[model samples]
Target: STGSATTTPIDSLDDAYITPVQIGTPAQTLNLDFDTGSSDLWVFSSETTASEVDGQTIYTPSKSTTAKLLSGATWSISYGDGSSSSGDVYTDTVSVGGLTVTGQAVESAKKVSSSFTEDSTIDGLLGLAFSTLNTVSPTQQKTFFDNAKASLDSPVFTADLGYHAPGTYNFGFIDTTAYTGSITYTAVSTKQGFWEWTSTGYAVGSGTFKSTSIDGIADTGTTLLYLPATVVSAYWAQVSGAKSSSSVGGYVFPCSATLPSFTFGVGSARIVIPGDYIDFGPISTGSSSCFGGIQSSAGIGINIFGDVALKAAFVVFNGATTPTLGFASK
Candidate 1:
C-alpha cells in the first residue's frame, strides 16, 4: 500500500499509529506505536488474564474516571510472531504535550500473551507507520489515525521515526517550530514505500557493512531486526552457539564469550545495539547471551530492522511537506 497526504505507509510503528493519551489529576501517559497496519492501542492492565499473556500489565478503567468504553466487544490481535490475544475497546481522555483530546480510543486486552509475554520494558504498539492495512478485515477494531485525525494539533499526524536504523524507532511531537523552510515529499506507491531497497549501505558511523547495498524494508508491521545477508551471517558467526539449534533453526549460540559487537549503516548514519541485543534471552541454562542483536534470518530475501532498531532514535518522513519525502532524522 502506498501513502498519500491522507495516508502514509505503515513504515514504522512510530509513523503508522495513533498515540495513546490520557488526562487526570496528576496526568497520565502511554507512549504508543500508532500502527495503521493494525488498529489498536493495547497496554498492560492489572485486570488482564495472565493466561492471555505470560507477563503483561493490565489496565483498569477505574484508574481514570474519564476512560470510556467504545465497545463492550472483546478484541484480539496477532502479529508476525504468531502470537495472539483478545481484548475490549474503550475511549478515554487523551493528552499530549499541551494537547488534550477527550474520549480517545483505547484497547484493553481481556486475554493477552503468547506475544506480549516479554521483558515488560516495551509495553504496547501504536501502529502509525503507514498503510491502510488491517485484519479488522470485514471489520476493523480501530486505527490510531482514524480515531486521532480529528484530534491531532495539526489536524494531521506526522512521522519522526528517528534514524530508521536496524534496532530502534524513537519519536516525539512534530514541532511546527522546527521548520524555517518548505518541506519535500515523495509520492507513495502501492508496492510499499519504505520497503524500497537499494544496494546502498553505509558504515556504522564509518563505512557500510555490505558496501553501498541497502536491503530489507523499513516496516513497522514486523518486530525483529533483519540485517543484510552477509551481515546476518557475520553476526551469527560471532555468537557462541551459532551452530545447529534443534528448534529455532540456523545458528543460535549458548555462551556470551563468543558474542562480539557489530554495526550497520544507511548512507552515513549508524545506530549501535549493545551486546544485550546480541545475547538471546534466558532464565538460566546456557542462556543465549546472543545479545538482542543477532537473530537468524539466513535465507530470508529481505532483511528488515523492525521496531527494536527503530525505537532507539529519531526518524521523520517529510511527505506532508510536499510531493517528495523530506526525511530528516533517519
Candidate 2:
C-alpha cells in the first residue's frame, strides 16, 4: 500500500527536483516538480498558448478516454519566486510512482508566467501541501497525497533530498534504512497551509546554541535557506571576504572559504547544516564569487528551510492527527 518515486536535481538550476508521473487513461508521462509549498496539480496542456509552452510535455485531455472536464471550474496559483500558472480543471486518473488516484483534479494551464515558461523541462507541479490551499474555485480540489492517503498503508510521506544528486519521495511509509540516528518528531502548525513550525533556537559557527525563536516553513521547492537578518549577519561575520552586495543581493563570500556549521533546535533534537552546504555555489558558473545559501529572510516575510537546509536531513511529513514532522540525520 506504499508508493515511492525517485527524483533528480534540475541541473544547473539546483532550485528543485523533477520526477516523472503518469496522467489519464493511456497514461501520458510528464516530468513534474513535487512542491510542498503549494496545493494544486497543474500542468501545461492543450489549452496553453503555444508561445508559453516551451519544451515541456503538454497534456492533451482529448487523447485520454478517462479525462473529464469540470465545466466552468478553474484554478490559478502564484509562487513566492514570482512564477504563476492558471487554467481550467478536469477530473482524470493520475499516478505517482505506483499510487494511482482515479478522478483526481487536474488543472490544465491556459496561461503561465515567464518563470514557468522558461523552465523548458518542467511540465507541471504536484503540490503536497494541505488541501485547503488548493486554488480551484467554487470547489476546492484535493491533492494527490490526500486522495491517495486513504488507501495508503500509512498516511505519510518522506522527502529524502541529496546534494546535487538523486533523491526519493517515499509515500505511505518511512524507510528506516534511508536515514541514520532516531527521528525527532515536532508539532506542525498548518494554519498557513505550510508545514510550519517554530525553531527553539539557532547557532552559528562553534558558538553556543542561543535560544531565539524562529517561525518558519519546511519548503522543498525553495533553493536557499532563509533566516532573520540578524541571524544571517552573525554567520556572514565569521566568514572571510563575505559581504552583502547591493547589486547581487544576499551574502556573498569567496568560493574557497570554509563556512561554519549551523544548527536549528527542533523539539529536543538539534538538526545541523554542515558548513560545506552553506556555500550554495558560485555566483555564476566558474566564478570565484559564491553566495551563502543561508540568507536573510528580509523581504521574504517568512523563514524558509529550503532545499539547502532540507537536504541536510531526512524529513518525514506525517499525516496523522496534528500532522507532526519528523527529522533525522542522513
Candidate 3:
C-alpha cells in the first residue's frame, strides 16, 4: 500500500508545515504538523480545557464508533521551544492521504501551553520519529508511521518542503521526479530516536569546503537551521551590517544586506541553500532588521538541520532494519 499528501507552510516564514489527517470512524479531519523530531501522535480534543481552545479544530473520540479508550494510558511532552502538552490516550482508526491504520494510538490533549493555543494554524502534531520516543507512560505507543509501515510497499517516507509554497510527503515509494541528481545515502543513528546523521562539513558561499564532521538531526518540525557557533559566525561575517544581538535575539542584519548561500556535505554530494533562504525576514513588520534562518546550536545542545536546510533538497527517511538517510538535489 502507498499514500501521499500535500503539506503547506503555515506562515510566510515557513514557521511550520501542516498536513491534513482524518481520525475515527466518522472521520474528524484536522490539520496537523508532521514533526520528525518527536514520536507521539497527539491532537487537541474534547478533553482539552475549553478556555485553552482557540480557532483550531478538535477531535472528539466519543463521536466515533471505532474509538476506544486506552485505559490507564497517559502522555506528556515538552519541546525545545518550551511548548508543552499532556493528555489521555485513545485507539482509533486514523488515515492520512488515503493510508489507513486501525487501532492507531491517538493521544487526546487535556492541557496545552499558551504557545500552542495562540497558534491557530495547526490542530496538533503527527510524530514521525521512532516509536521508542513516544511519551505515553506505562505503555509506549507506536507512531502513525510505525503502525502503517508494515502495510506500506516499502519502509520509507520522503519530505519535500517548499519555500512559501506547498510540498509533498510520500510513503512507500520515492517519487523520481521530485528530485534531481543521484541520491547520496548516509548511515542514521536511531539511538537518539531522531534521524541523526553526520554531515561531512560546510562552507560559506564560494569558499573552500571544510572537512569537519558535524552531527545533527534532520528535524522537519523546527523552522531554522542550527549549526556550530563558528560556522554561523562565518556565514554572518560575509554579510555587511550583520551582528549577534541580545536584544534582537540571535543574529540580525539590515533587511537589504546581501546574504551568502550556505553549502553542506552529505557524503561526496553537496547541497547548497540559496541566499534568499538565509534571510528569514524582518524581526517585525516594516522593520529594517531581518533575522537569520541559521543560528548557533550551542544553546540547543545538539545541531539541527531544520526546514531552512531541508528545503534545499529532497530527503528520504529510510526505515529499513538498519536505517539510512538519502539526500538528493531538487
Candidate 4:
C-alpha cells in the first residue's frame, strides 16, 4: 500500500510545516506537524486545560467510537525549543492521506506549553522518527510510520519541503517525478532515534568545497539549518555587515546585504540552497536587519539539517531493516 499527503508551510517564513490527519470513526481532521525529530503521535484534545485551548482544533476521543483508552499509559515530550506537552494515551483509527492504520496510539495532551498554546496553526504532532524515541511509559508505542510500514509496498517515506510553498510527504514508495537525477544513498544511524547521517562537506556560494565530515540529523520539526560554528561563520563572513548579535540571539545582517547560496555534499551530490532562502526576513516590523536561516550548532551538540536545508533537496527516510537516507536534487 502507498499514500501521499500535502504539507503546507504554516507562515511566510516557513517556520513549520503541517499536514492534515484524520482520526476517529467520523474522521476528525486536524492539521498536524509531521515532525521527523520526535517520536510521539500527540495531539491537543478535549482533555487539555480549558485555558490552554486557544484557536487550535481539539481532538475529542469521546466522539470517536473507535477510540479506546490505553489505560495506565502516559506520555510527555519536550522539544529543543523548550516547548512541551504531556498527557494520556488512546488507540484510534488514524489516517493520513489515503493510508489508514487501526489502533494507532494517539496521545491526548492535557497540558501544553505556552508556545504551543500561542501557535494556533498546528493541532498536534505526528512523529516520524524511530519509535525508540517514543516517550510513552509502561508501554512505549510505535510511531505512525512504524505501525504502517509493514503493510506499505516499500518501507520508505520521502520529504519534499518547499520554501514558502506547499510540498509533499510520500509513504510506501518514492515519487519519481518529485526529484531529478539519481538519488545518493548514505548510511543512517538510528542509535540516537534520529535520521542521523554525515555530510561529506560544504561550500559557501561559489567557493571551493570543504572536505570536512559533519554529522547532523535531518529534522523536519526544526525550522532552521544549524551547522558547526566554523561552517556557519564561514558562510556569514562572506556577507557584508553580518554579525552574531547577542541581543538578536543569532547572526543577523543588513536586509540590503546580498546573501550567498550554501551548498552541502550528499555523497557525491551537492545540493545548493538559494541565497534568498537564507535571508529569513526582517527581525522585527520595519527593521532593516534580518536573521539568517543557517546558524551555529555549537550549543546544540549536533548539527541540524532542518527545513532550511531540506528545502534545497529531496530527502528520503528509508525504513528498511537496515535504514538508509537518500538525497537527490529537485
**In lDDT terms, which candidate is top?**
4
Please report the TM-score between candidate 3 and the true structure. Answer: 0.99
- Tens digit of lDDT per residue, candidate 1, span 234-285? 5665544565454654445565464454454444444454444444444245
lDDT of 4 by residue, 1-330 (tens): 888999999999999999999999899999999999999999999999999989999999999999999999999999999999999999999999999999999999999999999999999999999999999998899999999999899999999999899999999999999999989999999989999999999999999999999999999999999999999999999999999999999999999999999999998889999999998999999999999999999888889999999988899999999999999999
Q: Tell me the lDDT of model 1 at 76.
A: 67
Instruction: Report the poorest 10 consecutive residues by lDDT, candidate 2.
Output: 7-16
Where does candidate 3 clash, by residue pair? Answer: none
Off by over 4 Å in 3: none
TM-score-best of 2 and 4: 4
Q: What lDDT score goes with residue 258 in model 1?
A: 42
Off by over 4 Å in 4: none
Between candidates 1 and 2, which one is better according to TM-score? 2
Give all TM-scores, in the order shown.
0.59, 0.97, 0.99, 0.99
Instruction: Give the higher-lDDT candidate: 2 or 3.
Output: 3
Count of clashing residue pairs in every prediction: 94, 0, 0, 0
**lDDT by residue for model 2 (1-330), tens:** 888899888875467899999999799999999988889999999999999988999999999999999999998888998888899999999988898899999999999999889998789999998999999998999999999988899999999998878899999999999999999988899899998988888888789998988999998888899999999999899899999988887799999999999998887788899898787788888999998888999999899989988888999999877798889999
- What is the lDDT of every predicted structure here? 0.46, 0.90, 0.94, 0.95
Q: Pull out the clashing pairs in model 4.
A: none
Error of 1 at 54 (Å): 7.1
